[PDB]
Amino acid sequence: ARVKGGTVTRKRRKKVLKLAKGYYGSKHTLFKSAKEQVMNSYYYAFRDRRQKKRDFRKLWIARINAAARMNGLSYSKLMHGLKLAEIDINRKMLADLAVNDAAAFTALAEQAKDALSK
Amino acid sequence: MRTTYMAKAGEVERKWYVVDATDVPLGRLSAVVASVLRGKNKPTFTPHVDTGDFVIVINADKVKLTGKKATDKIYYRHSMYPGGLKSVTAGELRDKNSRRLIETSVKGMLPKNTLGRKQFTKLNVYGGAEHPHAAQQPEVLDITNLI
Amino acid sequence: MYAIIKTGGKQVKVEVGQAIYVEKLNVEAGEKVVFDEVILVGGESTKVGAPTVAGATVEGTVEKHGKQKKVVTFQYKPKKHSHRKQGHRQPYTKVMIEAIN
Amino acid sequence: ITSAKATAKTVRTSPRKARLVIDLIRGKSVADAISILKFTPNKSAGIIEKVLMSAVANAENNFDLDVESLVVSEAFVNEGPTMKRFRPRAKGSASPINKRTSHITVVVTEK
Amino acid sequence: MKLHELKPAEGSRQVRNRVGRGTSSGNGKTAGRGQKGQKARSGGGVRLG
Amino acid sequence: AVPARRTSKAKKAKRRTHYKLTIKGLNACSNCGEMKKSHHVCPACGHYDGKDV
RNA sequence: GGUGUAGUGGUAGGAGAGCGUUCUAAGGGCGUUGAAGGUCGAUCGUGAGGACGGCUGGAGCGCUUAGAAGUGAGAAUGCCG
RNA sequence: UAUCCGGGAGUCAGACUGCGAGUGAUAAGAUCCGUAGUCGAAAGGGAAACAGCCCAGACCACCAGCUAAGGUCCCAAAAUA
RNA sequence: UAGUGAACCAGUACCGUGAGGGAAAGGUGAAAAGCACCCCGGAAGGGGAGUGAAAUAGAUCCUGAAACCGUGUGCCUACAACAAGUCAAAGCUCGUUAAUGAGUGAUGGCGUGCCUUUUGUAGAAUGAACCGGCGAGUUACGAUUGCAUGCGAGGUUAAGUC
Ligand SMILES: [K+]
Ligand SMILES: [K+]
Ligand SMILES: [K+]
Ligand SMILES: [K+]
Ligand SMILES: [K+]
Ligand SMILES: [K+]
Ligand SMILES: [K+]
Ligand SMILES: [K+]
Ligand SMILES: [K+]
Ligand SMILES: [Mg+2]
Ligand SMILES: [Mg+2]
Ligand SMILES: [Mg+2]
Ligand SMILES: [Mg+2]
Ligand SMILES: [Mg+2]
Ligand SMILES: [Mg+2]
Ligand SMILES: [Mg+2]
Ligand SMILES: [Mg+2]
Ligand SMILES: [Mg+2]
Ligand SMILES: [Mg+2]
Ligand SMILES: [Mg+2]
Ligand SMILES: [Mg+2]
Ligand SMILES: [Mg+2]
Ligand SMILES: [Mg+2]
Ligand SMILES: [Mg+2]
Ligand SMILES: [Mg+2]
Ligand SMILES: [Mg+2]
Ligand SMILES: [Mg+2]
Ligand SMILES: [Mg+2]
Ligand SMILES: [Mg+2]
Ligand SMILES: [Mg+2]
Ligand SMILES: [Mg+2]
Ligand SMILES: [Mg+2]
Ligand SMILES: [Mg+2]
Ligand SMILES: [Mg+2]
Ligand SMILES: [Mg+2]
Ligand SMILES: [Mg+2]
Ligand SMILES: [Zn+2]
């Protein structure tokens, strides 16, 4: 009852290689290099699915800060004022308003400043 | 939803500002200038796209150096030859080549990448109060409160 | 006219006639849904919810339930001869916005 | 119908050296290619010329194409079988020798 | 019973454990023997007692 | 000294960039119209400078 | 099956449950109107992995239940090509 | 949660940090104990980079929110408070 | 690459003074019907024309993977410091198992391979040139424990005969 190698080996390695399409040279051509690279890609992918959330929050914060400065306020003062005024609009929506609906962002800033004054 | 706005190259209008360096500490002038050049002052800021505005610095010769920086702050550079170290004091740079002084200060503050170098090109420094870029219709950018 | 509404622990901007993808909602396909937490309403004029705009609701219809593209979590530690592989397809509900109040 | 090809298989010549001459003639009128191959001193020029002339003969005899219009649309050299040989070296050890061979293909089209 | 529907009694039979067949199985590489030493050698180990 | 690392296909191709043949000096032969090398005898008609040789 | 609460990093290592390979039995199938194999694809599952199409190929092969193993390789200055 | 009975192990090279001692020179990233932690076998944030220090334990998805250490002039998120 | 070393003119070739060591190497097609004739070429080899269900089954002949080599081109690339990815993304090109599509990718963020062995390795410690195949806890007889079945103060046959 001999079980010769068969085709499972080729199938598994081909799956890895297909995962490695687009890599540089041997990193997509050769199974060993491809696998080693695919593992690093998995490591980076898992790590970046977390870093991606940080990056976009950072981006929204920066844009909100610019808009707040134009309206006569710092980012920190704006957020403190919004918390005082009970505004729960998050940073994603705030950044979108700053870029697209400048009037709406200005209205938000006015309420924030009023809460700060009170 | 993946709706965050991303600026495109060339869609953003870049204005021109004039910054007067008279009696402004070198570093503080440079910091505000670098933010403007990067575009941190505009809501459309997009890290992977250049969106900042152009800066014309005038009166570079009158930039302020607090403390004894005029004689103790030393700019080094190595020619990459053995014993090829050269130095020049910040005061000497201000007297002779003030453009270099401001440019080095702002290079240090911009990112060290292709985008950062491109943004640096948008800076123009002139010792004295007159610049050749009237054709661009630059507008004065007060920084008294920004520093 | 547009609104910003609270849904699935997240805030979404909604425009009439525009579909939106949200965390799976326990509503059958083709049935009406109403979002009651409207944190902002904008357009020609702006209304700001503090924290929610009073008596503002947004109506939609659940076009579809689906699963996003698979995501693979492959956790391994180099030189420790140990790896773990996992798959995930996040369910989502697609809702076409009918009316903004 | 519009194109004719000729192939010389298992030609004893270096594929790389042959590819040098092939790159010279690719994408040129048949007349220009003949001239280039006739004045090239490298060995593979003669072999490539025989293949090119064979292809032109095919285009005319078999398919009655217009010789004057013909141009070299496609030409390439593929690795052939390699004969394995050994060369004695210092201290009673041999080193392998690869006696390469080439497949030379020339395709000539009407225009 | 039917030859095409055989079913052993629950818990009557178990699957043999095979060592040295990959890490995720829990007996890859070292095959449960640990790291070096006498007990990790083929035919290794000391006499009883 | 021996190669520390094998040469990749890309680097190998880059190096061979300049490993190319060239053909210069061909122009039509006055006597017979065939292509010939300038300043050489025409191998076809065996004429140079308009005279048989 | 529902709800609730709690929990779910991990080497040596213990336990549990599975994927896939060849073969045997039984049942039920598929194949010159194209099997296995090869190749491509934007496909499915929580994982090993499973389908379905196009092309190639030219004669054997799946599926369900159970059984037996030369049953899974990426490393051994491993052997052969 | 502890015992007790039984099946199966691996481990007998440890490292650093804080605190208490010896050896050393009140030297060593030294050595040898006691005690706690971390690494080992722990990813993440901070300490520029930096196993062992500070904060904190990754089952997963999110272009949501609040904080820890550590930070808020520019690189570089946030006070030219 | 299994099965005898040997499926084939194998204990041959080959190696060694000798004892002795010791290989590699199977498959056209149903049937040779194994490409008459013509064309380039000195030939080899091709292109037609034919045989054939099929010649990309043409004798290196079933299938024909990967490494490796080359031709064509949709996108990108000559101011850039790159474990080569991943995350974000314009532009261009294309339209699929029709899926909140596919290829490429300027630019930006993060980021020192795999394995072994170590207190600790990106390690300037070890192993791998690449690809493919082969390549490591098995069996017999006993001991013991768990689980399962039958019988139960009982349980059970061994050799041997049919
Ligand atoms: K064990
Ligand atoms: K297929
Ligand atoms: K090997
Ligand atoms: K025990
Ligand atoms: K201690
Ligand atoms: K065939
Ligand atoms: K290519
Ligand atoms: K990158
Ligand atoms: K060494
Ligand atoms: Mg194998
Ligand atoms: Mg977070
Ligand atoms: Mg000799
Ligand atoms: Mg068994
Ligand atoms: Mg284990
Ligand atoms: Mg291993
Ligand atoms: Mg070992
Ligand atoms: Mg040991
Ligand atoms: Mg041991
Ligand atoms: Mg956990
Ligand atoms: Mg089979
Ligand atoms: Mg095996
Ligand atoms: Mg190998
Ligand atoms: Mg020590
Ligand atoms: Mg250890
Ligand atoms: Mg850590
Ligand atoms: Mg480590
Ligand atoms: Mg906060
Ligand atoms: Mg900042
Ligand atoms: Mg201050
Ligand atoms: Mg043999
Ligand atoms: Mg074929
Ligand atoms: Mg064949
Ligand atoms: Mg430059
Ligand atoms: Mg360039
Ligand atoms: Mg050591
Ligand atoms: Mg090596
Ligand atoms: Zn002539």
Side-chain angles (χ1 to χ4, degrees), chain F residues 11-28:
Chain F
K11 180 60 176 179
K12 178 172 72 201
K14 286 185 176 74
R15 184 180 69 248
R16 290 166 182 176
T17 297
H18 294 273
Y19 176 65
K20 57 162 154 286
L21 240 293
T22 60
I23 187 64
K24 298 292 180 65
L26 300 180
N27 58 19

Side-chain angles (χ1 to χ4, degrees), chain B residues 68-116:
Chain B
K68 294 174 185 166
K69 293 177 190 176
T71 61
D72 296 9
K73 181 173 185 62
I74 296 171
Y75 288 92
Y76 301 87
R77 66 184 182 277
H78 206 281
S79 72
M80 308 190 68
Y81 287 81
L85 191 72
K86 318 294 166 45
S87 62
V88 59
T89 57
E92 186 172 18
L93 256 184
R94 177 170 60 174
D95 281 359
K96 280 152 55 53
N97 180 352
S98 59
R99 161 172 299 176
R100 171 156 295 166
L101 180 58
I102 304 293
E103 285 184 1
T104 300
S105 173
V106 169
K107 238 170 188 173
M109 299 185 190
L110 294 178
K112 319 297 182 300
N113 58 35
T114 294
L115 188 66

Side-chain angles (χ1 to χ4, degrees), chain D residues 8-95:
Chain D
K9 309 214 88 183
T10 317
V11 171
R12 262 287 287 157
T13 189
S14 173
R16 306 172 55 196
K17 298 175 185 158
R19 282 162 190 153
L20 297 175
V21 187
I22 276 290
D23 284 71
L24 273 179
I25 61 161
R26 183 175 294 113
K28 301 232 161 48
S29 295
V30 167
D32 303 338
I34 291 169
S35 299
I36 292 168
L37 295 178
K38 256 159 183 178
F39 290 103
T40 295
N42 298 61
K43 168 195 183 174
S44 46
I47 303 172
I48 290 162
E49 183 172 27
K50 284 228 191 183
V51 167
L52 173 63
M53 297 310 305
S54 167
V56 174
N58 299 9
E60 189 188 11
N61 174 89
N62 298 345
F63 319 106
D64 305 324
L65 306 185
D66 185 11
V67 175
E68 286 65 28
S69 68
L70 288 182
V71 309
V72 182
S73 72
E74 184 187 7
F76 52 94
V77 181
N78 283 326
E79 302 182 6
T82 294
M83 314 191 302
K84 307 296 188 179
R85 301 288 185 270
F86 289 95
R87 175 137 287 279
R89 307 301 294 274
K91 298 133 183 291
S93 80
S95 297

